[PDB]
Write a structure and sequence with these properties.
Chain D: Keywords: 4Fe-4S, Flavoprotein, FMN, Iron, Iron-sulfur, Metal-binding, NAD, Quinone, Translocase, Ubiquinone. Chain D: GO terms for molecular function: 4 iron, 4 sulfur cluster binding; FMN binding; metal ion binding; NAD binding; NADH dehydrogenase (ubiquinone) activity; quinone binding. Chain D: One of its GO terms (cellular component) is NADH dehydrogenase complex. The structure is cut from a larger assembly and holds chains A (142 residues), B (575 residues), C (907 residues) and D (144 residues). Chain A is an alpha+beta fold and 142 residues long. Helix content of chain A is 13%, strand content 17%. Chain A has one domain: Alpha-Beta Plaits (2-Layer Sandwich). The radius of gyration of chain A is 18 Å and the shape is elongated. Chain B is of the alpha+beta class and 575 residues long. Chain B has a domain of 344 residues: Cytochrome-c3 Hydrogenase, chain B, CATH 1.10.645. In chain B, the strands form 5 sheets. In chain B, strands 1-2-5-4-3 form a 5-stranded mixed beta sheet. Chain B starts with 11 loop residues before the first helix and ends with a helix. The relative contact order of chain C is 0.12. Chain C has a domain of 96 residues: Barwin-like endoglucanases (Beta Barrel), CATH 2.40.40.20. In chain C, the strands form 10 sheets. Chain C has a 7-stranded mixed beta sheet. Chain C has a 5-stranded mixed beta sheet with strand order 2-1-5-3-4, sandwiched between helices. A 5-stranded parallel beta sheet of chain C has the order 20-19-18-21-22, sandwiched between helices. The termini of chain C are far apart. Chain D has a domain of 88 residues: NADH-ubiquinone oxidoreductase 51kDa subunit, iron-sulphur binding domain (de novo design (two linked rop proteins)), CATH 1.20.1440.230. Chain D contains 7 helices and no strands. In chain D, helix 2 runs antiparallel to helix 4. The complex binds iron/sulfur cluster (6 copies), FE2/S2 (inorganic) cluster and calcium ion.
């Protein structure tokens, strides 16, 4: 039996539309006291920021959860699962394919791009939350 | 507010110091430590110190002695010109007041007279200051390195000394072979302490692992520093928010008790008064961890000097306390749940039924503990008069906690200097009959465990409503739901977790009653997002320093019983 | 000068300054957006509000703006007044109503002035519940991305671009809360100084597009103080590295040289460092096969063949450091050392050096240029070569409006009042080129002519200023009228500036400019002279000396030189490609020490993996003569362990010791600099350019990384989970780590990056200066090698004859481009689209005689080769001339002043 | 600034209208009868002033549209309890010397007088409670 807030294995989650939630903002990497996160930003032709690589060194990780609370997209979360063990320390280094799970985890509904002003596919300018339509300077109305 | 900057000129100790040494003989610093801070010259250190020892309500205890580098400190308005400094924290129990004396030093002349004649507990503190800084204490009998080994070149708390292990060359085992050969040839050069001497010199190594060199008891010399983790140095290389996990590991049984003095001290630099719900939540988690530590001390105490068959049921009760902690915070040990301005989350919605189940469960077990320990004769006969000390010995060696309270000195921090809203609770302070020994200390802890359960009874029935985080711009991090929707809250959260919160240049100081003795945090801000100096006063350091004074005239079995009775852990001692 | 009372305390400040720049100099934090130290005060954002009292007894005063308020004697202000604090919080609150939720995906995040001021006011709670305004974006070209939603309408971008930089294609559109900053339509920003908008804009509207391909936050950067390598001006820069690749180029404040601004070639031309084609290991040829060697093997292998050779010659480079050329000179001897530039380029460079050292006329620094009252530009197309001088000359031309405003008692910081008083009045600026320049919008007169005609106007101005100067017979009355206009403005100036350079390709233009400066010096004027050179260390290589590259090629093809050590030089730019490739095939041993892949390394026998400026240390000497030190940014061996990239001076010194005593010597940087000072007295100042590797700030080494640098236990964890040791620097005072010092008040001149508590943006440079907009607190880095000589020169009497066209022969008129003419930066992929198509420019009468129009591919012959180019039409180009783009792929800069024998339509 | 029936029988001079809390202006007066809702009248006024801002200075360019949006909420009946105290703060911080010219001080002069003399019609707009945030599952909020 584990409580919901248990600080075991670190995963990266997904949007309800099915895209990866991480926007490679590097706040989780800097807020970690042990320095166990390395990542690089990439950008799609759509314009969506996403991580080119995501690397967590689980030999160094102390499972403090400061990365989860730093994340402004709810992408990185700590799950109730302590079942880890390896013969080699090199196999404690997890890449993005070992971390990205198929769903949204603890926060089923939050999508960051719906908040964001930046324009990606499916959300042009004025299609975000509390956002009006763009008015051109050449418009006849004063 | 209780955090605003004060010079404490209305404290009555300054006026009699003015009438004794003149107005030009010292200099008063305005801090947020809560105590007067006075800069004296090193030629007057002993005169000022022995004057405070025979005041009509005298200062009897040297709380802490350590140093600061101060060379890279840019905000130094009002202070005298110093290249290094040594601070002396003194406590008067009868006035319920403290004073801090600061001696300024130059970089070429790191020399100050030793304080050991007045206060005996200063011997280990000056050795640490000699170890971590390069201040020489003239007149010290055995001024050797107490943390690092004896061939370690360099003073690690100097600001030119690199903090990280990666900055040095790795463990290539060039020095491991030499340290192994040195350890294999363990011989006495008559330098490891006083060592006057026919005599059998024996090293015995046993809740923590440390070495002691004993003369067969004619002379005993603890060798510590085997658990030095550089926690104080770590404060210089971490932001105020990201340092919080390191606080939890100063004491393993402490948990959220250990985080409490640090967050309260940071909140004084930030100028944050927290809401009432934060106060009751923090007091709740601290009394849960205090109960867990006390049950561990009573459990382990009954096992070594008695039959351990009935008391093994206490593991199930500690499992219930760990399940309640990881239901609230998330993780069983090292929660790192206290935040600057509040806590990490709100209480989850089923907390009340679990706490009520624990409060219903506990009195039957507690009364079985009282029957098992108060009425027993064998352990009582093996614990009465076993390396005892009194009130004069306690105040000399800086012994606080159940030790000091077992003598007639009624001194708790939760009643004398209320913190975290402890003054709105109904609890009693148990006290002994003037003799501190192994039976009296355990009996006091059983009484404290019952008072802790009374505090938890008031927390469940008078849990108020409102936020779990203060409304203040330095509350780190902000509430997450506002961060996920509002740009100004997102901007504050962005800079706080990355560059760090900016604490303005000041010095804060908090003392709390810990699970074992009094634990404190003395923090200095130079205006940056990291601490300039972090000082952690742990009571176990004083408690382990006190043992050669009391054990002299006893057997090795009495040493093992005395070490098992004192409230010492080596993670606290070495930090 | 003046004394003001702030928040009860009392301070001494300069009376001429306003209250914002007074209080920021004292370390009092006032928030601000629309004010800039370079741009002046306009009063738009209303963020700098303080409460002002009439005297000490007035308890209730009024809110004023400190950027718009003079710091007069007797001023009583309160920054921390409660009503002032509430209003300053409200200004941030009003800006936060329309700001997008974009900080995780904003490239300004962690380096954002709006983020810093929002925290500094203490506004963290949103009350506004209504909709936000949105804007669409524009395409601004390959360098700058556009996101108008983040704009706070501070007007800094338009005030920089139109007023300061004199760009024409950026403006403000709309009205009320719908104001839009940008271009009238999409397209590339035309200004050569567009890239300073990323630092000037306090938000993330204008961001670096070259950095957003490989983005990282500022706290993850590794910084070093460096010098720009793209031309001779010597702008101080702060390059940032992450994961072994150079990421962005930042401006490094230097109050003597560049201050807040860089040019676009410096800011965006760094991509050649990040090429995959660069050599990373030493490579030795074996017939057709190639063998990879380590550092020890390469030195022992090279010195075995070099011991058997009978004569070894050395070819230096103008783009190599002073320590690298000297080490090459020490290895072959000074009798065998050649400079690597052509003889005609060498002759113009030593004459340019002669007038600076022996002319007796002071040569101004780049910021001192803005104080001069008249500017004559002879031959140097200065916007395309030496672009920051053109920015400095625009500010000098605005000095007339500052003089009129000072007479009317308008303060120096009130910029909109000064501009209103001015009304297109300018200090006189006279430029001469072969075609139109980018300074033509502000020039009093432009003279488009061949280079001998530009020199002949220069000698005639000197003869009309002094009777002893030699005269130019044959001047027509139309030109004679204009010469009188220039002479009356020059002689009537209190402080004239004379600008020329080596890029015109004429010895006579440089001779004409020294005659004008001499004639003004005899009149009593405080005259300055400025010469622009070609490369980053052109002036340094000229002070060292040596024979020309043509002499070196002679010693190869006449058999006497058995071996040649080429150092960081692609010889095709300086000499004919067919001659170079033939003469390097006769040599038994050719050794190249270059960081870039060049064409001459195909047949070379040994290549050494030299380091670029990002991976090296050294001293460069700029056009002024200032010796400046550049420091290594990152260790390239840290990430890739097979990388054997060493400094050029470290490779050549070790080779000399293995040649002498068979033992390699990996020397330290201060030993090489000491060796320079002893042998060459003219380079004695380079010792004092920077301190040595034993310099400490109270026992600490200067830090390269910010204190919150991340990923220490995960950066290299994909190769080995065991953390390696941190790279150790024995050459310089800097450490390859964050465990060091970067305090604003630390007693040093070399600042790797600016950061302060509460100031994460480029506005943190105010904490490092003595007064804001002034000099660095403990002095700007860099030292002048030579002082002004006591006595001057004689008048040059070598007046050229007037230019005459010839049938068949076509003179080559040089055209320069900021994004194409420089050797390293044209290999950047972002410069491939910013550079224009290759062309050939013809007079309309000459294209009518040839029978072609715009767009026709025409063929010509240079040195027996054939190049076909499409024709462009140039009305300002005089007949008999032919415009070529210098320094491109195919057109060497040695071609300036050459002749094209044959020209006909391509078939 | 608006004036009442009690403010008649008072001379049309600059300092006489000045001591009555208003400005004499162009001296061309406008009468408001009992059938005009004051909130709608002020909303029309602020809409003109907001859209006629030149856009140079922040408290005019961004402060005045916030006032317009609050008044539109008040006119429709969607006003929240912190709205009227925001209008008071806007009037204080858009006064003389705080903005770049006198446009913004002239804009808030009808607004502050109409709240002072006709607070009951502005208070009638407040029919909805305060909420500017939406619930997020898995995150407990900070309960004030
Ligand atoms: S996991 Fe979260 S904090 Fe880390 S880079 Fe991705 S979005 Fe940013
Ligand atoms: S849980 Fe803590 S140690 Fe582990 S990756 Fe996250 S921040 Fe780093
Ligand atoms: S410009 Fe600054 S405040 Fe705005 S989204 Fe970017 S980082 Fe955040
Ligand atoms: S684009 Fe940037 S610099 Fe220009 S007005 Fe907007 S915020 Fe200011
Ligand atoms: S002017 Fe020259 S040195 Fe300065 S940034 Fe431009 S190219 Fe670099
Ligand atoms: S107050 Fe005046 S200057 Fe400011 S935005 Fe309004 S109209 Fe423009
Ligand atoms: S900075 Fe002074 S009003 Fe904008
Ligand atoms: Ca180096």
């Amino acid at each position: 039996y584990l409580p919901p807030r248990y600080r075991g294995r670190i995963v990266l989650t997904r949007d309800p539309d099915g895209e990866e939630r991480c926007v490679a903002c590097n706040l989780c990497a800097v807020a970690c006291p042990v320095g166990c996160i390395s990542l690089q930003k990439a950008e799609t032709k759509d314009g969506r920021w996403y991580p080119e690589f995501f690397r967590i060194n689980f030999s160094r990780c102390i499972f403090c959860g400061l990365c989860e609370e730093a994340c402004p997209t709810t992408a990185i979360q700590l799950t109730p699962d302590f079942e880890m063990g390896e013969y080699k320390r090199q196999d404690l280094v997890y890449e993005k394919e070992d971390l990205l799970i198929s769903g949204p985890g603890k926060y089923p509904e939050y999508n960051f791009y719906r908040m964001a002003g930046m324009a990606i596919d499916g959300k042009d300018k004025g299609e975000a939350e509390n956002e009006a339509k763009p008015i051109d300077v050449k418009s006849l109305l004063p | 507010p209780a955090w605003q900057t004060r010079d404490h000129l209305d404290d009555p100790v300054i006026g009699e110091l003015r009438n004794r040494f003149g107005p030009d003989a010292f200099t008063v610093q305005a801090t947020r430590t809560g105590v007067p801070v006075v800069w004296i010259k090193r030629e007057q250190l002993l005169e000022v110190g022995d004057f405070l020892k025979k005041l009509p309500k005298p200062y009897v205890m040297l709380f802490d002695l350590h140093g600061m580098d101060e060379r890279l400190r840019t905000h130094r308005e009002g202070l005298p010109a110093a290249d290094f400094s040594v601070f002396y924290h003194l406590i008067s129990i009868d006035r319920n007041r403290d004073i801090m004396l600061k001696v300024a030093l130059a970089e070429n002349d790191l020399h100050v007279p030793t304080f050991t004649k007045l206060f005996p507990n200063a011997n280990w503190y000056e050795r640490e200051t000699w170890d971590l800084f390069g201040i020489t204490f003239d007149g010290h009998p055995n001024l050797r390195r107490i943390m690092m080994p004896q061939t370690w070149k360099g003073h690690p708390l100097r600001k030119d000394y690199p903090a990280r292990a990666t900055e040095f060359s790795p463990f290539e085992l060039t020095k491991a072979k030499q340290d192994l050969e040195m350890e294999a040839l363990t011989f006495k050069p008559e330098e490891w302490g006083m060592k006057r001497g026919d005599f059998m010199f024996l090293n015995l190594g046993p809740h923590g692992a440390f070495r002691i060199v004993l003369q067969l008891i004619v002379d005993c010399v603890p060798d510590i520093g085997y658990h030095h983790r550089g926690a104080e140095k770590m404060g210089e290389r971490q932001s105020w928010h990201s340092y919080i996990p390191y606080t939890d590991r100063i004491e393993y049984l402490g948990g959220c008790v250990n985080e409490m003095p640090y967050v309260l001290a940071v909140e004084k630099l930030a100028g944050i008064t927290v809401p009432d719900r934060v106060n009751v939540i923090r007091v709740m988690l601290s009394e849960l961890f205090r109960i867990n530590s006390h049950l561990l001390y009573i459990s382990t105490f009954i096992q070594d000097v008695g039959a351990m068959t009935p008391v093994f049921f206490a593991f199930t009760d500690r499992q219930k306390i760990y399940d309640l902690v990881e239901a609230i915070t998330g993780f069983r040990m090292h929660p790192a749940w206290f935040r600057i301005g509040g806590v990490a989350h709100d209480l989850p919605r089923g907390w009340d039924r679990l706490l009520r189940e624990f409060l219903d469960w506990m009195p039957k077990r507690l009364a079985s503990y009282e029957k098992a320990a108060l009425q027993n004769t064998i352990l009582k006969g093996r614990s009465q008069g076993v390396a005892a000390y009194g009130a004069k010995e306690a105040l000399e060696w800086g012994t606080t906690g159940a030790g000091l309270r077992a003598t007639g000195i009624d001194f708790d921090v939760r009643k004398a200097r209320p913190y975290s809203g402890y003054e709105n609770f109904d609890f009693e302070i148990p006290v002994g009959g003037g003799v501190s020994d192994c039976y009296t200390r355990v009996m006091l802890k059983v009484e404290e465990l019952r008072q802790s359960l009374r505090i938890l009874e008031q927390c469940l029935n008078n849990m108020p409503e409102g936020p779990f985080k203060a409304d203040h711009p330095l509350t780190t991090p902000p509430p997450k739901e506002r961060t996920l929707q509002h740009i100004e809250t997102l901007i504050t959260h962005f800079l706080q977790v990355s560059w760090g919160p900016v604490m303005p240049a000041n010095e804060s100081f908090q003392m709390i009653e810990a699970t074992k003795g009094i634990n404190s945090y003395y923090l200095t801000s130079d205006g940056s997002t990291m601490s300039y100096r972090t000082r952690v006063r742990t009571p176990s350091f004083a408690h382990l320093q006190q043992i050669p004074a009391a054990i002299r005239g006893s057997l090795v079995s009495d040493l093992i019983v005395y070490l098992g009775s004192i409230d010492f852990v080596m993670s606290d001692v070495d930090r | 000068m003046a004394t003001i009372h702030v928040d009860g305390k009392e301070y001494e400040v300069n009376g001429a300054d306003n209250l914002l720049e007074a209080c920021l100099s004292l370390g009092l934090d006032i928030p601000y957006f629309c004010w800039h130290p370079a741009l002046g005060s306009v009063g738009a954002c209303r963020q700098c509000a303080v409460k002002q009292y009439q005297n000490a007894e007035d308890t209730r005063g009024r809110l004023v703006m400190s950027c718009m308020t003079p710091a007069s004697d007797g001023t009583f202000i309160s920054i921390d007044d409660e009503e002032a604090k509430q209003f300053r919080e409200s200004v941030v609150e009003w800006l936060m109503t329309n700001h997008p939720h974009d900080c995780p995906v904003c490239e300004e995040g962690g380096n954002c002035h709006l983020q810093d001021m929002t925290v500094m006011t203490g506004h963290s709670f949103r009350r506004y519940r209504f909709t936000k305004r949105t804007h669409r974006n524009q395409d601004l070209g390959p360098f700058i991305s556009h996101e108008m939603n983040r704009c706070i309408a501070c007007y800094r971008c338009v005030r920089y671009y139109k007023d300061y930089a004199d760009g024409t294609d950026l403006g403000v559109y709309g009205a009320h809360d719908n104001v839009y900053f940008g271009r009238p339509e999409d397209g590339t920003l035309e200004s050569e100084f567009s890239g300073n908008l990323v630092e000037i804009c306090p938000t993330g509207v204008f961001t670096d597009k070259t950095h957003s391909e490989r983005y990282n936050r500022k706290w993850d950067m590794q910084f070093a103080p460096s010098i720009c390598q793209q031309c001779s001006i010597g702008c101080n820069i702060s390059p940032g590295e992450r994961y072994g690749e150079l990421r962005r180029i930042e401006n490094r404040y230097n109050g003597t040289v560049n201050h807040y601004f860089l040019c676009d070639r410096g800011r965006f031309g760094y991509g050649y460092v990040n090429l995959k084609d660069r050599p990373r290991q030493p490579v030795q040829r074996r017939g057709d096969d190639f063998i990879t060697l380590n550092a020890e093997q390469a030195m022992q292998g090279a010195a075995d063949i070099l011991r058997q050779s009978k004569k070894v010659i050395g070819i230096g480079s103008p783009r190599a450091s002073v320590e690298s050329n000297f080490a090459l000179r020490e290895l072959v001897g000074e009798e065998n050392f050649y400079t690597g530039i052509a003889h005609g380029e060498q002759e113009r460079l030593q004459l340019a050096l002669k007038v600076l050292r022996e002319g007796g006329i002071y040569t101004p620094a780049l910021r001192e240029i803005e104080s001069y009252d008249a500017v004559l530009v002879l031959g140097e197309d200065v916007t395309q070569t030496g672009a920051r001088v053109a920015l400095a000359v625009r500010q000098a031309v605005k000095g007339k409006a500052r003089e009129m405003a000072a007479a009317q008692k308008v303060a120096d910081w009130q910029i909109a009042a000064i501009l209103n008083i001015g009304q297109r009045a300018k200090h006189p600026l006279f430029v001469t080129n072969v075609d139109d320049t980018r300074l033509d919008d502000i020039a009093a007169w432009t003279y488009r002519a061949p280079v001998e005609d530009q020199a002949r106007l220069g000698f005639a101005i000197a003869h009309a200023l002094d009777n002893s100067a030699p005269a130019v017979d044959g001047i027509e009355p139309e030109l004679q009228s204009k010469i009188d206009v220039i002479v009356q403005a020059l002689a009537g100036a209190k402080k004239p500036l004379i600008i020329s350079g080596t890029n015109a390709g004429s010895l006579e233009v440089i001779q004409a400019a020294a005659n004008v400066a001499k004639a003004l010096k005899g009149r009593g004027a405080d005259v300055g002279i400025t010469m622009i050179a070609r490369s980053v260390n052109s002036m340094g290589l000229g002070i060292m000396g040596g024979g020309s590259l043509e002499e070196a090629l002679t010693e190869l093809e006449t058999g006497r030189a058995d071996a040649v050590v080429v150092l960081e030089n692609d010889l095709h730019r300086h000499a004919s490609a067919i001659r170079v490739n033939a003469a390097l095939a006769k040599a038994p041993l050719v050794m190249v020490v270059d960081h870039q892949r060049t064409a001459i390394m195909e047949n070379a026998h040994l290549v050494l993996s030299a380091a670029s400026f990002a991976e090296s240390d050294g001293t460069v000497i700029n056009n002024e003569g200032r010796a400046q030190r550049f420091f290594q940014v990152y260790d390239p061996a840290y990430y890739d362990s097979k990388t054997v990239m060493l400094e050029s001076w470290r490779w050549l010194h070790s080779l000399h010791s293995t040649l002498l005593s068979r033992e390699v010597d990996w020397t330290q940087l201060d030993h090489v600099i000491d060796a320079v000072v002893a042998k060459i007295p003219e380079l004695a100042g380079i010792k004092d350019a920077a301190p040595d590797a034993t310099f400490r700030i109270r026992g600490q080494k200067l830090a390269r990384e910010p204190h919150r640098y991340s990923g220490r236990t995960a950066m290299r964890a994909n190769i080995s989970v065991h953390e390696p040791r941190q790279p150790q620097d024995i050459d310089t005072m800097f450490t390859f780590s964050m465990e060091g010092n970067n305090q604003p008040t630390a007693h040093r001149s070399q600042v790797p990056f600016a950061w302060a508590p509460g100031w994460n943006s480029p506005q943190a440079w105010n904490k490092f200066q003595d007064e804001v907009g002034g000099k660095l607190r403990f002095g700007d880095p860099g030292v002048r090698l030579f002082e002004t000589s006591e006595n001057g020169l004689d008048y040059f009497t070598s007046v050229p004859a007037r230019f005459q066209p010839q049938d068949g022969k076509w003179r080559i008129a040089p055209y320069y481009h900021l994004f194409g003419s420089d050797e390293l930066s044209q290999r950047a992929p972002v410069f491939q689209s910013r550079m224009p198509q290759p062309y050939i420019k013809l007079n309309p009468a000459d294209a009518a005689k040839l029978g072609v129009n715009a767009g026709t591919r025409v063929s010509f012959s240079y040195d027996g080769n054939t190049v076909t180019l499409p024709v462009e039409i140039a009305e300002g180009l005089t007949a008999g001339q032919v415009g070529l783009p210098m320094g491109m792929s195919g057109i060497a800069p040695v071609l300036a002043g050459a002749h094209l024998e044959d020209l006909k339509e391509a078939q | 600034d608006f004036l009442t029936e009690a403010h008649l029988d008072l001379p049309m001079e600059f300092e006489s209208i000045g001591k009555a809390g208003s400005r004499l202006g162009t001296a061309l007066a406008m009468a408001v009868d009992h059938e005009i809702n004051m909130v709608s009248l002020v909303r029309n006024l602020e809409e003109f002033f907001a859209r006629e801002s030149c856009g140079w200075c922040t408290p005019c360019r961004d402060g005045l549209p916030w006032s317009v949006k609050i008044l539109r909420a008040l006119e429709r009946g969607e006003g929240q309890p912190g709205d009227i105290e925001t209008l008071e703060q806007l009037c204080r911080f858009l006064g003389p010397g705080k903005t770049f010219c006198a446009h913004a001080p002239g804009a808030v002069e009808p607004l502050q007088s109409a709240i002072k003399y006709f607070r009951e019609e502005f208070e009638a707009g407040i029919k909805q409670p305060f909420s500017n945030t939406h619930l997020i599952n898995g995150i407990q909020p900070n309960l004030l």
